[PDB]
Predict the structure of Alpha-galactosidase.
Amino acid sequence: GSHMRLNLGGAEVFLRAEGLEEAPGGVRLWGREVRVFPPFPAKGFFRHGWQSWSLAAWVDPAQAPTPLLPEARRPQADDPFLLEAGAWWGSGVGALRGPDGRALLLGALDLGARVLGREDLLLGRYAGKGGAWFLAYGPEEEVFAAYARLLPRRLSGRPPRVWCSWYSFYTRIGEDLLLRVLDEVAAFSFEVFQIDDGWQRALGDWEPNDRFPRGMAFLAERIRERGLRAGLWFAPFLVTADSPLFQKRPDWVLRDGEGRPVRAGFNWGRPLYALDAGNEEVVEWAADLVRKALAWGYDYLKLDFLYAAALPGAEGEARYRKAMARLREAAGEAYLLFCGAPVLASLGLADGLRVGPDVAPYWDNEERSFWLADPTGPGLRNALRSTLHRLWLMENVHVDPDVVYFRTRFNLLSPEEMRLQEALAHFTGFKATSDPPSWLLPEEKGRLEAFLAREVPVRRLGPYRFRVGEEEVDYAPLL
Amino acid sequence: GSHMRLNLGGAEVFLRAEGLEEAPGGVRLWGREVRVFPPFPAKGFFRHGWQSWSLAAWVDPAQAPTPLLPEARRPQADDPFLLEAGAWWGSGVGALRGPDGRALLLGALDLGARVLGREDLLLGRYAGKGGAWFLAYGPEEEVFAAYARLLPRRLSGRPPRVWCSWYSFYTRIGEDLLLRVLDEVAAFSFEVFQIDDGWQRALGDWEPNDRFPRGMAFLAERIRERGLRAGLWFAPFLVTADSPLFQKRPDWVLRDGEGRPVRAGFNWGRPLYALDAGNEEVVEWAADLVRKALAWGYDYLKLDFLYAAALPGAEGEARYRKAMARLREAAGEAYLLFCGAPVLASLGLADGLRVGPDVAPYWDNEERSFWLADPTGPGLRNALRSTLHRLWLMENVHVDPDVVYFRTRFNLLSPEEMRLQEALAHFTGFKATSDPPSWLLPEEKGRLEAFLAREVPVRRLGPYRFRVGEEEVDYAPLL
Amino acid sequence: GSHMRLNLGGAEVFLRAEGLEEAPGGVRLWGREVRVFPPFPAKGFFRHGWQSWSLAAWVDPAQAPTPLLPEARRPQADDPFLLEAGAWWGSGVGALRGPDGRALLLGALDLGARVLGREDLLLGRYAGKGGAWFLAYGPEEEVFAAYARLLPRRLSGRPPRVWCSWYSFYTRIGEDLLLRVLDEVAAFSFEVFQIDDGWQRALGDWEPNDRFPRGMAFLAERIRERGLRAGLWFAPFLVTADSPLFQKRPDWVLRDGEGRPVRAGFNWGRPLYALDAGNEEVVEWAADLVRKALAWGYDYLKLDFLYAAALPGAEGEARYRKAMARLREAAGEAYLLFCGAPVLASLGLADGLRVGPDVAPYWDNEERSFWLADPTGPGLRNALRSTLHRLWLMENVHVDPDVVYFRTRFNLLSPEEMRLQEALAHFTGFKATSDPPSWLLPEEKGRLEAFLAREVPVRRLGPYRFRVGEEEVDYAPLL
Amino acid sequence: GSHMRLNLGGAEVFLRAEGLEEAPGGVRLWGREVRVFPPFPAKGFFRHGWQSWSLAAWVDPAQAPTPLLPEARRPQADDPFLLEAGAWWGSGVGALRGPDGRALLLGALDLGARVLGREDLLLGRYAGKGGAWFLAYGPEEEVFAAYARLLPRRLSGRPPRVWCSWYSFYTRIGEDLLLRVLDEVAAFSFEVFQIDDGWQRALGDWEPNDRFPRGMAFLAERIRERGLRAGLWFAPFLVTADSPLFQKRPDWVLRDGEGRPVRAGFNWGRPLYALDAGNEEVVEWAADLVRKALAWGYDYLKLDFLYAAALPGAEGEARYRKAMARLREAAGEAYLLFCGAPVLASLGLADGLRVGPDVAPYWDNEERSFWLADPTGPGLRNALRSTLHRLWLMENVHVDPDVVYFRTRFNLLSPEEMRLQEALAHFTGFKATSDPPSWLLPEEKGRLEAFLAREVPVRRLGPYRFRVGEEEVDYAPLL
Ligand SMILES: O=[N+]([O-])c1ccc(O[C@H]2O[C@H](CO)[C@H](O)[C@H](O)[C@H]2O)cc1
Ligand SMILES: O=[N+]([O-])c1ccc(O[C@H]2O[C@H](CO)[C@H](O)[C@H](O)[C@H]2O)cc1
Ligand SMILES: O=[N+]([O-])c1ccc(O[C@H]2O[C@H](CO)[C@H](O)[C@H](O)[C@H]2O)cc1
Ligand SMILES: O=[N+]([O-])c1ccc(O[C@H]2O[C@H](CO)[C@H](O)[C@H](O)[C@H]2O)cc1
C-alpha cells in the first residue's frame, strides 16, 4: 500500500503499510503485506521458527539456508514453507540487527503471519487475511519485551515442579516400574508425577496398553495418595496408518486438495499423519480425550505434536487456535503443557510451552545436526539454542526449557553442560527432571532436592550471559 | 469476443474483437485481446522493439527467435517478455506483409500492449486492462503513416543542432577539457553544447564530481556566453549497488514481489537497478533533478535509460507515462531528448526520441551482434536498422538517429558508411555530432559546417531508398 | 577359462576356472576370474567388508545395496569399489547359503581379490594379476574354519589385557590426567596401559603436544614402574591438509593419476589424506615411528586407519602388505594391534586385529546407521554385527571385538547390552576397557576385576548362540 | 618412476622421474611423465598456450579456468585439450612462482608435451612417446633463458622491416590499390612489401583472384623494381567445405577415427577444416605452394593458421614438425614467418614467429575477451599480454609482436596505447606496420620513418618494465 516515513528509536525508518497508529514501545501497522527498511546495514536476521522444536536463532541473511534432511522429517521440524524456501523466512516475528546491538523488530499481532529477512528489508506477509503488526527500534531486549506485551497472556501462578517419565525410560514404561519409581520420587519436593509416551495402545487409541493392566485411573490415584498431582501425555491430533482410528474413520484424516493424507512427519519408525483439526467431530473426539483424562484423576496434561493440528503452517493457525480453544475449555483449570506446538499461536491458551528441541543425554548428535542439517533433533545444544531465543515469552506463558539432568549414570552430558540447562530452569521457574532417584548418586540426590526446594535468584546481564545466584553463566560459545 | 467480417483495403479480413468502428485509413477495434487473420500467406512480420535500442525490423515468422545473451543484459535491450518468449512478440504494433508488398497492421492506441506474429495471425494483447486498436491494410508507408496520426504528437518546430560529448570522450570528460572543446565547437553552426555521461558523482548522485570543480552552473554560463544553449545528460531512474542513494533510500529501489531489487541490466561493469517510478517521492525527486538542471542554466536535457522507469515491460508503461508526465512539466519548455526509452509510450511527452541503438566508431561488433545475438549493442549497422523502421514517427516527435561522424581520426567507419548516417540526419533533420574539431582534418571541418548550416531537401522513394539533395541512398544491402 | 564339473559336499557343482586340485575341506581353484554355480536357490550372500570397520553380514542378494552417505566418508568405511557398485561385492571371500543352512564359500588365498554375489552365482575377481582360490560346500562353520587354515597365522599365546584411553576421554587426554588414572588402573589385573589418540601434535607430527610436557618416554617409564607394559596409538599413513608434513613433504602424499591427493575420508572435522605406502621413503619413516616408540619404552602399538596404506582398495593390498611387513619387523616382538585395517591382508602380520566398528556408549546412532545408511559408524550394535561374522579368524590372529564397558556413568548402554559385549570378549579372549575406575560404582569395580582375572570357559553352539561359562547368549535378535 | 631428491637454486626439491642428469642452469630429467614438487607454497602458475594466438600468462592455480566460447572457435584458440580441461594445463613448459619472485620451471626438450600446474605440483606429461625435460629453480628471467638455450635456434641476422597489407585493408585488397600504396611505401625505409590475406581465390586455391588480373609474379616484380623484397601470405593447410580442393581431393582432408573431418575453427564466416599434414601427398602440394611463390618472385612468406597441420594438439606435433621441415627446405633461405603456429614445435624451422594474438585498431573487444572468455581474439591488450610472456624466445627465433600503429585515422587506439606496442617492436627488433602513408598525418609520417631508420637501445628492468631509449615503459597495469 502506502509509503510512510517514521521516527523510531531516534532513527528515520521508511516503510510500506496500509495504515499506521501509535503503540507502546513502537508503532502498530496494518496490511496483508508490510515492508520495513532498516536505516543501517543489517548484520543479523532473527529467524523465528514455527513450533517448539523449530530453530530460533540469529542468522546471516547473506548466506543461503541449508535444506533440512531427510524430506520425510520436515513436517515435524518447522513450517513446511520456511524450509522449502530459498530465502530466510520466519514465523510470526522477525528482527534485523544494527551494528550497535539494537534490533528493528517486525511482529504479527494476529495469526498466520510470516516475516522475511534480507540485509535491506523486513517483509511481513499474512498467509490468509491481513492483520496487525508491531514495529519497534531499540535495544534488543526492550523491543522483544514490548512485542510480548501486545500478545495474549496466561500466567497461572508459578510453574509446577514435575517428574517426567520420558528422559530416562522413554517408551519402555509400565505400571509396575512406575509404581516403584513413584515411591522414590515422592520423597523429593515435586508437585506433579507425569507419565509420558508409552502408556497408550496406539496413536489415536488413547487407552492403556498391556503393561498398564489396572488402567490409568488406578495409577493416578496412587500418585495422589502420595500428595502429588498426576500428569499424562497425549499426541491428540496424530495418527499412523497402523492406527485403528486411521482405518475406522478415514474421513477424520487431514487430506490435501487431491484427498491424499497430508504428511506429518516420521517417528517411531513410521510415517505420520494428522487428524483434521478443522473437522468439528475430530475436535470433539480430541476434547473428549482431555475430559477422559480429567475423569481419570489427571490435572496436568502434556499435549504433544500439536503442530499436526495446524498443518500446513501459517495457513492452518486459525483452525489450530479454534481447536485448542475447545480443548482449553474442556480442561477447565487443569495445567496444559503445549509441546511441538506453534509457538505464537499457542499464547493465551497454554499454561506452559516447550520453546525448544528435546534435551537429550548428549550434547549434539553431529550426524543429525550437521550432516542432515536438522537443528530440531534431540540434543542439549539444540535445546538451549532455541530456548535462549524464546525467553521473551515468559511474559505470556510458563516457558519450558525441558527437563534438567542431575544423574551421570545413563547420561553422556558433562557436569558443566548440565549446569547450563539447570540455570535456564531457574531463570524460567520451570523445573522438571526425568531422573529416577535410584539412578542418582548420593551427591546427586542432594543437588536435585536443593534445586527443587530453593528459589535461586537469577538475573539476565546480556543476550547470552546470566547471573544465577552469584555464579555467572555464559552461553555465547554455544552458537 | 465477437467474430467479425470486414472489407479492408479491398480484401476480406476476418477478425475477432469486442468492438469495431470506422477510422481514417482503416478501423478501430476494442478489446483486451484481439485477433486478425490475414487474407494472404504472410511472408514477413514487423517486429517492433520496446525501447530506443530494441530491434525494429521485418522478420521471418517461420524461423524461431534467437535468445539474446548474456541474460544479465536483457533488461536494457528490450521488454523482458519479448526476449523470454519463444514466439515473435512486438511492442505496441505489429504488421504482416503480403506477397504484393502491402502490410496488414495492428497497433495499440493505449499503453501496455504487445502484438504476436505468426504467418497466419496477428494477435494483440494488452498486459493491463483493455484498450483500442488500429487495424489497416494497404501500402506499407500509408498504414504506418495512418497509424502515426492517431498517436500523440509534440513537434516543436525544428530540432536543435547539438554537439554531444559522448561519442568521442565517453565518460573521460572534465571541466577543463570541455572548456577547450567549447571554444573549438563555438566556431560552428551549433545551437546546443550538451555534456553527456561523465560529469556526475554516481548514478543517483547527480552533483558534479572531482573533474568538474567549479560545478555545473559555471559550465552552463560559459556555454551561454558563446550564444549556445547548454545541454545536460541524466539517467534519472537508474542506480547501482554502490550508489549512495541505493544505501540511503533502499525504499526507493524497484522491488519484485519478494522484496528483491528488480534487475535493470549491466553497464559500466556493474549490475544495474531501478528507482521505483510508481513511488511518488521518487518521481518528485526526479522532477527536482529537472528543476535543478534548469536552475543551473540548462535548457536541453538528455534523459537516458528511461526503460528503467517502465520495468518490467508493457506492464510498466502506465507508471512510466505518469512519471514522465511530471518530468515533462518541471521542464516547462526545455527540450527533452528521450534515450533508452519506451518508444510509443513516450510520444507527446518527448521533443526528441532516440529510435535506434547507439552509433559507434565501427560498423558492427560481430561478437555482440552475431555470437551474443544482441542487435541492441552499439554499432552503426545496428543503429541504422532500427532507425529506418521507425522513421514513420517523424510526425509525432523529433526522430533522433544518433550523432553523425565526420572525423576519420579515432574512428573505424569507412567514408561510405559515414554518409549513410549523415543522410538519415538530413532526412529526420536531427543534426548532432561528437567530433572535437581539433580531431578533424580541414576537409572534414568543411563538411561538418556544410552539414549543420543549410537544410538539404530529402525524399523517401522506397522503404530503404532515399533521395537526399539528389543522392539516391539505398539501405537495402545492410539488412 | 575352462568349464569343470565337481562333487563338492555331496552335491554337483559347476564351475569355471583355469585350474583345479584337491584341498583340505574342498578344492583350490586358479584364475584371475573364476565362476561358481550353486546347486541350490541361494537365499543369502555373505558380504565380507574390506577393513575392520566395514560391514560383515549375511545379505539378501535380491534387494539392491543402499548407497552409504555422506560420500566423503566412503574411503574410511570400506573398499571404495564395494560402495560405488550397484551389485553385492565382497572383499576376499563370499559365500552363498542354501535352504539347509549350508554355505558355498569362495575365498581368495592371495592379495587383491573381490567376490561378487547373486543368488545364481559366485564370481571371484582379482584386481591385479591372478591367484588361487578355496571353494567348499558344507556346514557354515566348517567351510569358514577350513578357509581360515589356508590363510596366514600369527597367534602369539594369549592376548594381553589392556586399559585403553579412548572410550572415556577420547582426544581430551593429558599427562597429568593419565597419571591419575594410571594410579587407579594399576590396582586391577591389567597388563597393558595404552594411551590412545590424543597425545600427538598432529597427524604426521608424532611428537608429544602441549598437554604432555614431559614427553612420552617419561610416561612409559611411569607405566612400567607399576608392572605394566606401555601402549601407544598411531595412525601412521594418515595426514591432514593442515599437518606440517603435508606441507613439508608434499611428495609423500598419495596422489591419483593427475596429481590430486586421493581422499581418505573425513574425521576430526577435516578432510583426510594418505601418505603414499609405495613410497619407500614413507615406509621407512613409518618404520622409524615404530622404532622411536619402542625406544620410548612402548611394546604395545595400536596402529590405526591402516586402510590409508591400502587405498584405493583391493588394488592397494600389495603395497599395503609390504609396508606392513616392514613395520612388523621394526617392531620386533612388540604387540601390534591393527585397527581400521584391511582384514585378510593383515593376517600373519598383526598380533591383534579389530574386526568391527568402534563400540560406543550407546546401542545405535539411528541417524548414521539408518538415514545415512552407514553401518561402519561407532555403536555397540554395529560393532557386534561385524565381529560375530569374523570370529572364524580366531585361529589366525587375536580377534579384537573392541573394549568392554562396565561403567553406567557416562554411558547410555543398558546392562543387558553391556553383557553382550563382555561375552564376546570372553569368547575371543581379547580383554580391554576404557573405564576410569573412579567413574565406577563398587559393584562395577568388582565385575571388572572378575572379568580380567580368571579365564571363563566359552562355547559356540550356533552362529549367534554362545555358552560363556554357562550363560547361553543369543545374538540372533540384533541382526 | 623413481623418487629423487635434489638441490636446485639453493633449495631442496623433490621429484619423480625415470632418470636425472646435470645440465646448464638446472637439470635434465627423463620420463613420459615427471612430477616436481615446489619447496614453497606456490602463488602463480605459468600457463603457456599452444600456438601463436594462445594465452601465455601467469594465472592463479587455485581458481578454476573459464570455458572459452563459442565451442566452434576453440580449435583456433589453443590446444583443444588445454581448453576442455578442468585443471590448468599448458603446452611444452610450465612454471610455479615462489613468494620471493623466483620460478620453478619444468620444460620439455622434445615435441608433444604438456605441463600441469597445481599449487603443490608441476606435472609434465608427454602425449606420445616419452622424452627429455629441463628443470630449474631461480630468478624468473634466468630459468627461462636457461630453458631457451636448450631448444632449437634459427637466428637469420636481424629481422626485416615489413610493410604488411592486413591491418588496414584486411581482405579488401587488389592489385590496383596495392600498386598505389607501394608507391608511397617505397619512400620509407622498409625492406619487405608483404601482401596479406585477400589475394587468393579460396583456401586451397592459391591462385590470384579477380582483383589481381595480371597475376602475382607481376606484382612481385614491381615491388622489387622499387628495391623491396616481396612477401606473400598463405594458410597452406587450411580449407573450407566451399573450397574446390575440399571436394576434388576428399582424401586430403584430416579426418578423425570415424572419417569425419576434424574441426579446425570458424573464420571468414565459415567452418574451417584441415588438410592432413600426415599425408605425404598433401605435404608436397604444400611445399609446392612455397616454391610456386618463390618462382613468382617472393622471398618472404607468411605461413598462417599453421596449427591446422598439428591438430589435435600435442599428439600432432610430430606430424607438424615433419611437414614444416619439408616446407623449410623447399623455401631454401627465403624468410618464413610462422603465424598461428605451435610455438615451441616451430623453433629451428621458423625465421620469425608470431607470439601473440592479432593486434587490432582497438584495445580490447570486451564482448569477446570477457563475455566469451576468449583472450585469443584480435586486440592490442590481448596481443601484448601473450607477447610479454614469450620474449624469452628471442634466443631462438625472431619474435614477432605483430604490426605497429602510427596512424590515428581509422584506428581507435590511444597514443599511449600505441607506444606500448612500438616499444616491444624495438625490443624484439621486429618492425612492421600496415599503415598506408596517405592515412598518416605529417607528424605521423615522421614518427614512422624515425622508427624504421634508427635502432633505439632498449633494456629490460623487470618482467613488465622496460627502458626504451631513455623512456621507462611499464606494462604491469595491463594484466
Ligand atoms: O526430532 N524429532 O522429530 C522429535 C523431537 C522431539 C520428540 O519428543 C517429543 O515426544 C516425546 C514423546 O514421544 C517426549 O514427550 C518429548 O518431550 C517431546 O518433546 C520426538 C521427535
Ligand atoms: O547496453 N547497451 O546496448 C548500451 C549501453 C550504453 C548505451 O549508451 C547510452 O548511454 C550513454 C551514456 O552512458 C550515451 O548517452 C548513449 O548516447 C546512450 O544511448 C547504449 C547501449
Ligand atoms: O569414521 N568412522 O566410522 C570412525 C572414526 C573414528 C574411529 O575410531 C578409530 O580411531 C580412534 C582414535 O581417533 C580410536 O582409536 C578408535 O578405537 C578407532 O577405531 C572409528 C570409526
Ligand atoms: O581470433 N581468431 O580466431 C583470429 C585471430 C587472428 C587472425 O588473423 C590471422 O589471419 C589474418 C589474415 O586472415 C592475418 O594474417 C593476421 O596477421 C593473422 O594473425 C584471424 C582470426
